[PDB]
Amino acid sequence: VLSPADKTNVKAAWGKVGAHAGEYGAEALERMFLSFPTTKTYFPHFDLSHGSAQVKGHGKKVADALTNAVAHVDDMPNALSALSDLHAHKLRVDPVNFKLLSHCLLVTLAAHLPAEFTPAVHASLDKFLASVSTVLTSKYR
Amino acid sequence: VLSPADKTNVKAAWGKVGAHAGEYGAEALERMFLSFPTTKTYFPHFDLSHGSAQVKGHGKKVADALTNAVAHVDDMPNALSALSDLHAHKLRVDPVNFKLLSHCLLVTLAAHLPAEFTPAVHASLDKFLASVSTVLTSKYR
Amino acid sequence: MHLTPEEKSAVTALWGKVNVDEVGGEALGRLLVGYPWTQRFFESFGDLSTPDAVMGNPKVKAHGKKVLGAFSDGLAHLDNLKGTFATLSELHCDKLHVDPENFRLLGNVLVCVLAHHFGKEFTPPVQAAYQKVVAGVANALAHKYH
Amino acid sequence: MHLTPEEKSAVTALWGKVNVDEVGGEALGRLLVGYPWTQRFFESFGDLSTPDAVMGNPKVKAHGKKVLGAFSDGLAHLDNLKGTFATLSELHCDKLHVDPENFRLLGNVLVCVLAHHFGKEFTPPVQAAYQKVVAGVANALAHKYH
Numbered sequence: 001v002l003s004p005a006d007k008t009n010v011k012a013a014w015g016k017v018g019a020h021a022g023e024y025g026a027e028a029l030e031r032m033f034l035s036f037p038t039t040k041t042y043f044p045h046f047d048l049s050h051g052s053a054q055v056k057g058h059g060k061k062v063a064d065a066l067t068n069a070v071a072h073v074d075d076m077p078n079a080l081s082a083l084s085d086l087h088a089h090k091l092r093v094d095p096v097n098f099k100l101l102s103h104c105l106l107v108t109l110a111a112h113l114p115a116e117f118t119p120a121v122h123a124s125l126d127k128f129l130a131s132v133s134t135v136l137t138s139k140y141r
Numbered sequence: 142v143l144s145p146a147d148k149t150n151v152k153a154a155w156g157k158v159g160a161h162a163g164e165y166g167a168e169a170l171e172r173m174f175l176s177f178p179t180t181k182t183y184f185p186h187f188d189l190s191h192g193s194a195q196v197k198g199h200g201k202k203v204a205d206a207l208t209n210a211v212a213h214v215d216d217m218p219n220a221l222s223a224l225s226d227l228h229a230h231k232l233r234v235d236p237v238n239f240k241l242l243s244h245c246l247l248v249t250l251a252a253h254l255p256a257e258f259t260p261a262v263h264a265s266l267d268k269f270l271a272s273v274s275t276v277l278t279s280k281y282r
Numbered sequence: 283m284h285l286t287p288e289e290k291s292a293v294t295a296l297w298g299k300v301n302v303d304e305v306g307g308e309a310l311g312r313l314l315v316g317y318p319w320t321q322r323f324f325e326s327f328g329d330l331s332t333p334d335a336v337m338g339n340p341k342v343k344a345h346g347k348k349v350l351g352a353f354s355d356g357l358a359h360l361d362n363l364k365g366t367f368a369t370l371s372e373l374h375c376d377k378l379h380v381d382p383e384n385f386r387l388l389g390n391v392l393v394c395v396l397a398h399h400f401g402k403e404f405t406p407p408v409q410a411a412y413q414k415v416v417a418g419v420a421n422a423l424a425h426k427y428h
Numbered sequence: 429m430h431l432t433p434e435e436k437s438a439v440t441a442l443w444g445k446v447n448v449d450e451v452g453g454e455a456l457g458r459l460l461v462g463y464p465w466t467q468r469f470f471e472s473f474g475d476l477s478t479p480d481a482v483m484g485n486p487k488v489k490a491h492g493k494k495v496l497g498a499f500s501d502g503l504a505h506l507d508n509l510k511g512t513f514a515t516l517s518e519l520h521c522d523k524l525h526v527d528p529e530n531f532r533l534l535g536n537v538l539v540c541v542l543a544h545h546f547g548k549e550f551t552p553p554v555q556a557a558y559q560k561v562v563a564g565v566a567n568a569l570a571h572k573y574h
């Protein structure tokens with residue numbers, strides 16, 4: 001569970017992301033594709049080339065969803081229900097891949113927010129992504 | 142989330158274990174130690190040799206806790222508070238390990254409850270062990 | 283493999299007693315039921331709405347036999363699973379888009395089916411050797427992913 | 429260890445810019461803070477009650493530097509990690525009883541640390557090379573477990 005501290009940490013670091021969320025979402029995806037190539041099996045229909053608009057497009061959607069979870073940090077299960085259903089029933093992404101993306105998202109933020117990416121913030125952001133992943137995977141079976 | 146069918150399946154299967162749970166606890170550990178030798182890092186103080194009373198006793202302890210969990214399948218979080226505490230703040234076993242013991246437990250049940258280990262029951266027990274795993278690692282951070 | 287002559291013989295000897303037809307259909311079926319998301323690759327098989335519908339689906343059973351067959355033949359090249367599954371590794375990557383994590387789910391299901399079938403015979407030391415093989419197989423199959 | 433020549437040059441060029449003293453302390457400190465369960469091996473280190481207590485603990489800093497010291501040496505023998513890390517693997521197993529999963533957590537933390545420090549210089553492709561490396565090191569450190 002996320003503590004008040006965590007909550008403050010996340011709103012703060014995400015606060016800084018602001019308008020770059022979309023681009024950071026795209027970048028986390030590319031990092032993931034390059035470091036964990038097995039994740040590509042889920043996007044056979046995508047142009048995964050550098051600067052692919054499909055990836056750009058996708059990065060934004062993911063960032064929008066994270067932004068929405070931050071806005072509803074106290075009711076994530078409900079704020080993300082629809083996305084939980086989609087992933088459980090249609091996409092059927094194996095659960096292990098959530099940890100991979102989470103990891104690439106953390107690397108992206110670190111790379112962009114040197115001043116805010118403190119030990120404390122890092123830990124809060126990691127618990128946060130773990131919680132988002134748990135929600136998205138809750139309806140799998 | 143354990144469905145009513147699941148809770149039923151579990152109570153039935155565990156029902157058949159009966160007076161052998163302790164022996165099955167012991168057997169699951171032995172299978173874990175041999176198949177996943179990295180798990181032995183948590184028991185440096187034990188005699189991990191076949192038929193060790195240390196291993197036997199621990200086997201009962203684990204079995205017993207599972208029993209208590211089946212019994213309170215509706216209130217696991219509460220039924221296992223203390224155990225969740227112990228593991229998070231004292232033992233501090235890495236979360237990956239819970240999946241290994243869970244697996245050795247299925248294998249043991251399967252080998253001992255042929256008739257009862259149907260495909261539907263297998264699925265239920267797995268979810269159950271997963272739930273139990275979540276509970277035991279919920280206070281880690 | 284990092285199989286001990288003793289470990290090799292145990293694997294080999296139990297296998298000799300296996301009905302691939304039955305074990306193949308049961309392993310794949312149990313997979314589809316325990317880990318529902320693996321069904322994303324078998325939409326064309328039909329109705330997998332229930333344990334019963336999965337366990338009974340002939341397409342499932344027949345796919346199961348094909349998979350354990352290939353597995354079975356790999357046990358004959360236990361000293362080069364890599365070379366034995368190379369082509370199958372590319373296929374799974376490039377044509378099927380199967381996440382290699384699935385190879386590990388199956389392996390574990392396989393072990394549960396064997397324990398199920400052999401009871402007593404499937405001892406801790408025997409499971410230990412099989413765990414090494416299933417892992418080995420999954421690694422070989424995942425080897426050509428890029 | 430599938431390090432292409434170009435991946436190896438990239439690992440090496442960046443490693444040239446690292447202050448192992450500093451990176452070592454940050455990586456270790458951050459692990460104890462992010463995954464507090466890992467604190468189980470350091471009860472003799474004193475106060476690890478808060479982030480500042482961990483990050484600033486002279487013992488954590490000193491150990492971090494030692495750990496990264498051994499890692500840096502590993503980077504000079506990318507060809508023979510197993511050999512390079514063999515006595516250490518044995519020690520971690522037999523004397524320290526350190527669950528190898530700990531080696532993979534540290535690797536991920538380390539990647540975040542390099543990202544933190546190098547910013548934009550830690551490109552998608554450089555991260556992918558480092559990912560292969562931390563995994564190879566974790567594997568080498570676990571090779572002697574039994």
Ligand code: HEM
Pocket residue numbers: 039042043058061062065066083086087091093097098099101132133136
């Ligand atoms: C916290 C992590 C994740 C978030 C917030 C997330 C969110 C989303 C969102 C918002 C969409 C678009 C749905 C729509 O069409 O409106 C989506 C689609 C998708 N996601 Fe997830 N996702 C996550 C993890 C993953 C992972 C780890 C994978 C696989 C490696 C994945 C694979 C997919 C796929 C294949 C689609 C469909 C894309 C398309 O066809 O356009 N997702 N996700």
Ligand code: HEM
Pocket residue numbers: 180183184199202203206207224228232234238239240242243273274277
């Ligand atoms: C299925 C999940 C598990 C359950 C229900 C469980 C239950 C228990 C119980 C009932 C105890 C004894 C408490 C006491 O001594 O009063 C215990 C202790 C312990 N458990 Fe857990 N356990 C689980 C998973 C694990 C795993 C996966 C590991 C490590 C591989 C582990 C490591 C330990 C250790 C090292 C002890 C203390 C041993 C001793 O010094 O006596 N547990 N656990």
Ligand code: HEM
Pocket residue numbers: 320323324345348349350352353370374378380384385388419423
């Ligand atoms: C022990 C691991 C496995 C082995 C040895 C194996 C082997 C095979 C073989 C020999 C084929 C025949 C296709 C051909 O030659 O054209 C095949 C096809 C296929 N496999 Fe795998 N497989 C394994 C695991 C899996 C898993 C776990 C999945 C998904 C859950 C999967 C999904 C498929 C699919 C979708 C096909 C194509 C069947 C069709 O054409 O309808 N495989 N596999």
Ligand code: HEM
Pocket residue numbers: 466469470494495496498499516520524526530531534565569
């Ligand atoms: C890159 C991975 C690692 C490397 C290269 C490494 C290297 C080392 C070295 C060189 C030593 C000193 C050996 C000696 O005392 O003779 C050491 C000791 C130690 N390591 Fe590791 N280490 C690694 C990861 C870890 C992790 C992740 C943990 C725990 C989470 C850990 C726990 C310990 C402990 C507890 C000691 C002994 C400290 C003491 O003196 O009391 N190591 N390690």
